[model samples]
Target: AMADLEQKVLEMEASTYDGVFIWKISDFPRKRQEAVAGRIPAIFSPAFYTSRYGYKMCLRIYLNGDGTGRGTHLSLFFVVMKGPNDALLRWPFNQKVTLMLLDQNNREHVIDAFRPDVTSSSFQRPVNDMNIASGCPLFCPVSKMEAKNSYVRDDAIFIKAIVDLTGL
Candidate 1:
């Protein structure tokens, strides 16, 4: 019910990025339990940018899954958000997206990548704060994560996302 007043200020200092971002989700076990219980259905990453004056975007993860992935797989999606630089950027956002569930031991990781579907509204310039999220609905299996292999460690998990910047 409360706003992320402090988080906003703190993130304002370290929030913007250039195409790539690594999100560390600490307290994984606890968080997972809450997710499984439905107390928290979704977790969102801090907003990022394609460049200093590029498109604004963010990542969303459904720890307990959503749509077709419900109850079995972990869902991950991309969100296009309206930003101060929208007028300066191109329309119908088209960029390649690479997602990875990091392996703690750096041995094997869960990875998925896709090109934006320009025909979809998800890739269009935003009229609202955020466009409908779209990406892998079946990103990874929660069972695999529960195995607690190199993908998860010390009750912490990491997600690495790369938004292509070549066309720009």
Candidate 2:
């Protein structure tokens, strides 16, 4: 559910966090890149778009903890919308997108998050989805939403995702 992702992002702001981090496949381990890269033949596939001016990206996320950490997995899609007269990846992502969560147990959950309907449109903008707080599901062992003492050490989460660019 979206709460899982929202909870993650929210908890990261805690002072105990080392600092939330996200790395591109190329920046991760080579073996991981190889394995995750193979999950999608191409980041931009033919089925992703109906026009030549738009593109879609699919990704597989892999997380490996030290075997003593929190275990979790997440999957989601990001949409990049380009206007009819704009260049690909230029500007203006859609106001609506979806996020899915894959916990460590392999349970699959979906969340409606990420929208461009905000006052302005820009890349990497964290748009809130109304459905996240209540509609989304979560599997965190922590009883509190706060992260300071929320999780034990060695927590890990992986994500695999597919995005559709048809809205552009």
Candidate 3:
């Protein structure tokens, strides 16, 4: 009976959040330098944003390479948090997550997205954990990213995570 209830909660869908998550890069050069030095693997922003449905998520930015590769590109990930209300939440999040790197100067936005593959184990329901991270390893090339007058502007970079509400 307990397992049955848990399964039902895991399957529950919450209202999607209408906004996106943005990260400012006041010190991109320092972070890039750290990545080049192989001192920092990745940096995670504080858990600030919440989904409309009630679940919380965070942004994880990889400076260097994230094991899968090394010093290749700037990687970005979205982590779904296992909240206190998991009993009323859905498992194996099937929502479509979109990541955007905003170009402050121009209107162009560098975007990448992911949809959970139900057939894959990685996308499966979390049995026990506060968060699950999903994103692109090669979000953008490191060298090209630092060329100036591009995505990075005013010493700040913006990142956004948009949830496809329709998927819910």
Candidate 4:
């Protein structure tokens, strides 16, 4: 019990975060089933911090995609949250954001990197819990993930999001 408690605390500490966050969405086939059945559209990763006391953020993924991606590519977006550290941090998060689909085979990964369009509301300070989601509308093709199964293994898929720390 003590070991379990310690491991739990360690896990919590890991989530405290930096500019990088990795999310594993399990039940891979079930997610596809849900997407095709129209039972679910998208999912959001657990909110993480850009630093111990910096901006809060999360990743929003459109499993079935939206807008230009529609039923083709997987759309990935980033959201900045209203945190208690808002006063300490700068507004208009003009950082470079990178999203990746980790290949389970330990080979090629699907990478999409971009600098925040500071002119958009998505990059502005959030009045609510988070700013509007903005990023690649066509991140990677669904067929890429569905056909090879290289990105999915053990009924799970991994995604990594990186925010440029020096972009400040």
lDDT of each: 0.86, 0.31, 0.67, 0.83
Least accurate 10 contiguous residues by lDDT in model 1: 1-10
Cα lDDT of model 3 by residue, 54-95, tens digit: 555667888665746467877888776655665666666667
Error of model 3, residue 44, in angstroms: 0.7
Question: Which candidate gets the maximum lDDT versus the true structure?
Answer: 1
lDDT per residue as tens, model 2, 42-98? 121111332344432222222221122223321222433232334445343442444
> If scored against the real structure, what TM-score would every candidate get?
0.93, 0.29, 0.77, 0.88
lDDT of 1 at 98: 97
Query: What are the RMSD figures for all models against the true structure?
Result: 1.9, 16.2, 8.4, 4.0
How much lDDT does candidate 2 score? 0.31
Off by over 4 Å in 1: 1-5
Deviation of model 1 at 96, angstroms: 0.4
Question: Once model 2 is optimally superposed onto the true structure by TM-score, how far is the C-alpha of residue 9 displaced, in angstroms?
Answer: 28
- Tens digits of per-residue lDDT, candidate 1, 94-121, equal 9899999998888888999999888999
